[model samples]
Target chain A: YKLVCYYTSWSQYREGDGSCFPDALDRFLCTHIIYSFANISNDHIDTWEWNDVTLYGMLNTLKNRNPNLKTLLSVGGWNFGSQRFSKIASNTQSRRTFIKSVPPFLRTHGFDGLDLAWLYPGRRDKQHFTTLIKEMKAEFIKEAQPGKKQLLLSAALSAGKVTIDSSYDIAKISQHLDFISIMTYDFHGAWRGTTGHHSPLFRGQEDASPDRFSNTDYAVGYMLRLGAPASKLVMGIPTFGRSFTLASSETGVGAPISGPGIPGRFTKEAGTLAYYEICDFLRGATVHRILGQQVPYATKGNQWVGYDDQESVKSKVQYLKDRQLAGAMVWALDLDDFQGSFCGQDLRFPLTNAIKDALAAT
Target chain B: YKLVCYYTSWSQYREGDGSCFPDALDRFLCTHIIYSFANISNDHIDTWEWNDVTLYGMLNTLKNRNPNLKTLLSVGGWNFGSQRFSKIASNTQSRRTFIKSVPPFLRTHGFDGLDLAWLYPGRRDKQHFTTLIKEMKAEFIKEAQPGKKQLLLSAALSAGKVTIDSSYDIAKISQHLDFISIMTYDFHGAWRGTTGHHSPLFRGQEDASPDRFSNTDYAVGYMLRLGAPASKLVMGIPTFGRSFTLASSETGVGAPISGPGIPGRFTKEAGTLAYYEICDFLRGATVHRILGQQVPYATKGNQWVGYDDQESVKSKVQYLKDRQLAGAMVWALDLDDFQGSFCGQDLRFPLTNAIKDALAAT
Candidate 1:
């Protein structure tokens, strides 16, 4: 199984946990570590801490432990808007400039290749996106060596109907990138105020009105039909919870909700909770199962937390493995209980280890 | 696990049943296919049917079905004696002549590289053997292309102490090889009339002569100590069974034996049976286990047969995988039933599939 993990740059700066610096990473656990958000401006790529010590240097140090571990620079994210990319992608000169800008940065800091995380592309930008990927691949191939692994190009794509259809020339784009990762979570987070499942395994009976492209199965099925080979598609796993504040009157998944749940005690964001915090929250909370969807949720008083625990993660891994997908990917390495202090289980990497066994449990 | 298989040229001409042709092989079954015994004369490579066309073309066609499958044209085996190789390898001019002769053949015939099956080499020829490999690797390097796999070079080495010690400059040879296959079978066959287990897992209690260095574990361990990385050693498996005639009063594994057993009904070899034939022969035969050795045997009256069963093969694959070896190999694919009929099993490939699952049993 090819294990690809995203390690966010800002993860190293957490208040108490303070360092995700290469030294803390479980180097052997991942085949590829993509440094998230490499800062894209106009048509150029820059470092996240441009004025500080290069994190690229620190991340590259991971190879000292696992000489074969590969690292890639991820350009763009949920924070990096699609408008700037759509503008550049639609223009030939800027798209070419964007593609050419990568190789040099890759060579200077040492990266196996690049992963494009263009939050979401639109229908009109499809042709240009395909062209950009093709040109990037051609450029990568131009510098190939006889027996060496060449520059790998991958992309994290939207799983919804509008973005997926409008943003990709499925067959054409599939031919250009080495792999395509589908963001299979956050289908219905706080953005959808009324209660609904997030990253549901399927559209359940409770969803009398289902978002056509929300569930995990539907996203993967659509992507495969859209020309993503089973061997080149990676299903993404979110290490955080999607939550909603309930209406005092109704209390189930389909119940009416008023707003996002209270911010996590440590993670601190409305409706957001790290897996570690969820472990604590689920302690005395009454958790309920989403039968057909194969996900779990909990509601302590008015706080409803929809999250993936060990069971759900294992099931998702199996779903992908059964289809012979490349492997599973973690949204970020930080949000999980990396230090093993949460849940009082004293186990290191409570979530990712579940994924490892599911992929290559041997 | 890396699965390597040996295919004999004359298998297609099996007296009554024809066609073990290149097109007939299941390409996905192996990671590497080695064409056995491409005859060697003086310093040049030839074929069994010297007066006819090269079977290399037919054998090389498997790559079309499995693009990742690698092909190696093996030159020399037990039938092809060591005399010519001794002369060719000893003299610098002839050794250089021998090394230069491979590229055009490998290039024109579409082989990944060459696997030398030169039955045995000696202490006197040690330096030349190293020089030969180095020179062959250099010649192979000279033919490299920008985007293609480099021309791999491997050899089948004897597991016995005398030849292993005399024939190889272990450390030097290690650097030039992609892998070295240890011929882990045939420690005792019809050549020894005593009912002893051939390819025993260990030096069992029966060995007065002990043959301490002949068992599989000793061989693999010796090779690793002699500088072959465990990851670069491919353990070999035989598809045929070894048999012997038991002493009139005995019918067990360690019992004293008289002479060879009656020839196999189909294999028609004195004291031997192919896996499929053994499957038939053991219809009512009593199968016994060599306790300390962990191998199985079957006996009926004075006939004794020692061979690898599904269980034994599984155990060996586990042993290799646990040690993180490169792979396991098969000897003479034709010896087994390609069709499921002979074994009376509905599964088309009972034995090979056992090896496959055992390797990836994780």
Candidate 2:
């Protein structure tokens, strides 16, 4: 029943300042927030520049400001990689030692729990992924005492088929974990041959079996059937989208989308640009939707692209509530217009409010 | 060899109180000092009112005063009786959790290393003891990264047959540890019915056996034979003695040192009316040697007692040097004259000079 909002390192602007945390705490009634990383470097875990005093100060301020906020430390990311985990998990002694070191680490840093974002754990070896979680859980219980708030343990999982089969043992792992977030975006992108929806529930007409699949329904249903409790399953949504270029003839539904042929006009100079950038290029961009598959595509003159919009997000949230799934997660909060420009001039409020209204109606 | 001095909780003055510790610090040459029990309870462990702040403050002061000084946090002790160890060792989860929690604990309290003092591990659960050490060692390495001074890990063990046989796999455990302190004192005490010297290596007048064992030869030999490398073994000596009373007819040469009567006194309280206080009663006491035990006894009026003094301590130090052991440990530094009562009017100068001279000779 608890609603949670996730922010990442990229969400610095919407969330204000590089420490935009305080503002996010004010706006979102989110009880739980996960900090993306403290140690994420190519060579080693980067120690944050904020010393203990400053960190503790910020935590105290946040705690006072937001009466019901639980922060978790998330280690690793798609870019951070898993180089150190393998070194620490190769031997029993090493594993035991690492377990012992983490509790005090949590307490010292003023975080409530840990969220392991290992990209894809079971991709290379399924058993190792299970063992890592088991050991970590064991350590958590051991270090935690009777009255202290128990440290929450969760993970961000990939939504692809290989990810489902290799990285997670739903029944076994779900029993030991508090929750799992399924990354449901990136379903269709420039990497694929044809233009289609970036995050669609069903495959577009360009796909071979357009009528056979619905991405969201399959992911959520499969997880539940495999033993993931509905309350512990959270579906992910993306604030940003993938873009591509197309030949003049491939302007609509059947067009083949490829990498950009020219520089983007409204895209941010640094960092990943949002879906609104593509929308703002409407003079050159044309839009189309695949009928039964429920996907949308856009073309800017000769450039063709597929992505999600307020309408698609509305449908996803509606599907989430209808299925009684826990809730929905935005891949990021920053990409949305806090000033309400993208969704009819209300930043992400239109998208967020739409989901809230849908959940309320359900 | 490192010269180590120990201060038990029984010391009358407070180590945390600036005035008292400065004087104590001046006596040991600032080599390695260990504070006893950070977690054990009052009754079982020595009850000291000093809290975390006091301990940390004192260590900081010592470090500032003497830059090369190293102090360790010792957990558990003789009277504390490690009953909880079995529970701690039974679960791997608990062990790992404990390991993870230690670094933050050390960082908070400003301790450099951990000294595990689980008394009498013996043969019953030697594997458990080894596992505990192995787990802790791994955790220490994980927590203590480069750029930080390495955290030290050590343990205290007894030098008797039952203890050596029952509690540990010394060689295997040592490989994962920094050092081991052998408790070589209390070899003989007033609890025994016969009058014999406490902590002697050689047999004296009491001919229980012809092969007399001197303090060094017996205790050190046992350790060496047990595969305890000399550099890691610290020889122990006592600053106090065990006393007893004797019947008039049983006085002198192999007499049964009976109890219920008054004993000798230390010089400061020499001539005082108090008989229960051993420190004051040993001043004018005359020591008599017992055969086959290589220990000495003191007789005063109707009381006959056995104990170690300046001569025996000197001999033990020499023995440590001769055996090339890591260092020599005094049972305590406080029991000696802190106000020049027994040390030629310079307080700890006599004991300090003697140890310095012994090390110099070696």
Candidate 3:
């Protein structure tokens, strides 16, 4: 049972207490804290940000406080794209360079594992990605010293069936990886110019075609059908909401949207808002939970945002347990209300803590 | 709140103890035993079989044994076709003649209600069918005596979304009907020349259109989405299995099938097997339970059959409870191993009793 929390590097640049530094972390909260994302430079592992080296040192030091803590360094993300990963994994030498460089980075920084967080690999890179995972797992095993625990290998994968079929050889990767985290969010967003929950627990009534396979339940269950073992599957939950600028007066899900929603005051990202920002924005907003889907969305005049509340988060936790999955994974701990300034609940990291509390119950 | 069991009149023709008559019924087994099916003679309701009057008399007398039992008359089935229903409902005078005759028929036969078991009405009869339902419900209310219970107006509906949208206005029907039973079986049969369960609790991996919206979960959820209140929704469960003859050596689900399965010694229907027949055949067969779907399929030689076992029935019971449905409705009580002559379980009505026990637990 693992609670893998992702900690992003750029959050250090946010002003005031809004910034989530390594000091804000609760050592016992997560079984594993994955620091996302390191850059892929010259077909090898490299730091994404200048202060990543300093952040890694501080991030790993929390293990001293809780010896059970496991830290993994993640490489690549949506912004990083898949070209670099395709380039590195398409050839044997490039793959080896990245694979071989992994162990030393983990060992030197006291990190416990490596997560091949490639944004996505398409049909062209499908088998090559599997090969890269296998080779990397084998290299880690071969480099392990007596008395040291082996570095855990995992990958964050797309939840869409089209992407899963094109990017993964599930059976092959299941054997090589210690665990696989499915990024079960971002299923719907402003890019689609329509309102839909980014991470619905179950399928919405209107969910059909291209978006037919979009829910967290279908995503994880599809993986099992594709031969991924239940014990090695981790379900991902998001700490942010996908927002839209309503095209008309309609604010319900599947309603037409003009474009990306207004940016947050702190996070300052268009179309997406951190849980804290959502808390503030939705304070005066009329909210409606998608009945069968068990997730909530808020409407404030022409603004619409779909997101996970504690109710939805806990439901996902139960879903993971019911599916006999390994554990839950959060995309990034920084997005949650670390300081509890918003939401008026005064519960710090409410969503992340909700997962922890629910997981602990059974 | 309602365990509506359909007791078919033709089951009396089944050979030996395989024959299920009114006497074989457990008075308390079902809250309501709907004797299927009354015929549509001219523009009025008529008994389907000559001795149906005697069967109805005996069936309704179960109320004396279990005073809570509510008996209903079902008017159309697959063999009856939709033409008669289309004719009767297409015109106001014909619809009036049918609606006016319902109460006296129920009163004379000791029936507490009527189920418009029109196998399917299609797009042509959509509004007419709705009008018929509204008028019948109104007449039942108008004809009600101060001392008597008002007649229940339910319909056995097709679970397919296409049929659902085409044949009925869910909101209109929900407003008028006492409870609606969705015939969530026969989604796949030998007619398709392939193997698939007639009734599945959830969607199978290979399930796609035209079999896409075939599972019980989606069917019922779709109804809720279409505006049917869960409290007035009764889910239909089959006591029989749909089967096929393998075209080749392939016996798994979705495998090619040449034709209908060999007929049962008792039910003697091609492509269909009662629970008792399945128990006899599957005794030595290799059975594989669909993982996510939660139903079993077994194969022996070139014979393959998909069906519900005690496990699947219990799961469906839980599903109804989880969905907050009014209750479960068996397609027909005659199909289950009612005499305890098969399955080596010694327990009579294994599938039916399973529903009762599971429903009782909560």
Candidate 4:
């Protein structure tokens, strides 16, 4: 079981931007730490900066903590976006360059493998993405050196109707990958005007096409039904909040919003706060467990944010484990109350711990 | 006056990822401890997550043991990759957004400085990278908050023709960064399978891509000759070793490889072994010095490995000191025997100690 957690590199950027260092994480909670992300330039793979030297070194440094833990470098984040990948993956020459570069790079960097964390492959990216992965698979096998572990390959995927129907030839992609991470978050965020659950476990009361398909259960189960094996589907959970400014006093999720909520005190973004920030925000704030969604939204004054707490995470993990799925993951390790400080009274890594515990218990 | 040791954050991710603890480390050994690798998010400086050791409280806590020690948050890891920077650096608004975002964040955090770890930037990335650094220096000055040390900026750079000449306008980038770390190691390894010194002081007769250009002597002299001030450039010395599977029973470097060699009992990776492993392996293996390349390699049966030991490090240090260059740096702290358990004689940090003592003595 590849119990993965996406460790965002940004936590160290800001003073308190969720200082979720790899060392501080509960090694018992995850089997693989997918370090997000690596950069792409032209058709070549590139390093974001100096620590690129140390990213793999330090990610595995935690091996002292849990020898069983594995680390993969995730490439193409939302910020890394999709175009360069499309361009690179589309061509044989560039794809060859990418394939040539990855194995040696991963072998040298102390990474167990690579994770394609593409934001989403566009409708036309089907063949390009597939061709790239297929060539990569061949290269991976060909590059197997004596006494070394084989690399594990995977992808972070979209659960949207558009992406599912067009962006992937699921069978081929899954065949080559060890697993695929269904990013069931962002089902609702500052992007949407009205508040809704970002990562609902099941379909909510809303019958909209996105809401219906974007739920965790549907996405994972759909991938399983659509040629992705049940064994290789990892569902993603958020350790952060998608916030909004209440359009009116009207509360629960579905309540309209004036705009994205004012910037978070820590994240400083209008739409969201790391999990710890939400934990701080949740203090003295009102909580509403939206009916049918099984997820919660918190409100205080004009600030209305929907996020996952321990209880919600427990349900998601249970759903995932119950179905005998691959495993569950935190959208990011940094966003959680990693320090066990901000997220209300000893709730440090509450959701992260809960997910691990629930899965372990089962 | 500068001594940098790359600290892997993953060391703490496991019980003994590498057993390198802030508490276990001798703070007096070097001048600066770079908490290696906080990642970047597009235009923003990023974190690797909050860990106890690298956190503001803990990283600064070293102050107790050594009041003068400085900590820098290293961003851009090899695995983190760099398309984000290339794109972010190239685009005007993105560059400004990145520039606008840094200082306040670093100031609020406990970091005293930032290290850019972008690998070899694209030849095109030269101007963009320069602009990024120039703007960053300006922003660092403009956002100098009261009650905090001004942030220092440095970069871990490559020593290649295409990289130095094309990827960077050395003079401009050097001026923005407080120092430039020249990666003088990895002249060769298991990649070539043929045995070769990973970081030879001078080139051997078997001249190749690495033979002429990648050695410690050429890179530093080249950078100095190419307008980088010698005083501000720090040369990287590997604290690890590279191993290879001998293609033939006969051999020296340039031998074909059957595969990677035996793994370190601890690191368990193939083709590569930490410095401590090298020390231990030397006790049992036959070592040969390749002519012209000022480094030693070990060979036994089909296994051939190249590495720098304490004695060789002493020589390299003297060479750097002779050149009147700035201090030297180790590739990593943990890769050195932080626990002192791996090397045959229980010599903790033999390679590191050698470099520091030599640098000081000179």
CAPRI verdict (incorrect, acceptable, medium, high) for model 3: incorrect
Q: What is the lDDT of residue A2 in candidate 1?
A: 75
* Candidates' chain B TM-scores in the order shown: 0.93, 0.82, 0.97, 0.92
CA-lDDT, candidates in order:
0.76, 0.60, 0.85, 0.75
Instruction: Sort the candidates on TM-score, descending order.
Output: 3, 1, 4, 2
Off by over 4 Å in 1: A50-53, A145-148, A206-209, B1-362
The docking category that best describes candidate 4 is incorrect
| C-alpha TM-score for every candidate | 0.49, 0.45, 0.62, 0.49
Candidate 1 residue pairs in clash (backbone atoms < 3 Å):
A123-A166
Order of candidates by lDDT, top first? 3, 1, 4, 2
Report the C-alpha lDDT of model 4 over A1-362, residue by residue, as the tens digit: 55788887776665754555666777667889888778877666667756766656667788775888888888888888677777777777887888788888887777888988776788888878888788787778888756557888988888775688888888888989988888888777555667776776655332222344656666776778789887888888888888888888777656788788777666778888787888778778989765335578888989988889888887777667656779887788878788887754765577788778887774
Report fnat for all candidates as fractions from 0 to 1: 0.00, 0.00, 0.00, 0.00
Deviating ranges (above 4 Å) for candidate 4? A145-147, A189-192, A206-211, A344-348, B1-362
Error of 3 at B25 (Å): 26
Give the CAPRI class of candidate 2.
Answer: incorrect
Best by TM-score: 3
The candidates' DockQ values read 0.01, 0.00, 0.06, 0.00
| Model 4 reproduced share of reference interface contacts | 0.00
Encode model 1's per-residue lDDT on B34-153: one tens digit a residue.
887676665777667642245677666778767999988898888877777888888787777778778876777788889988778767778878888888888787778555568889
Worst 10 residues of 4 chain A by lDDT: A203-212
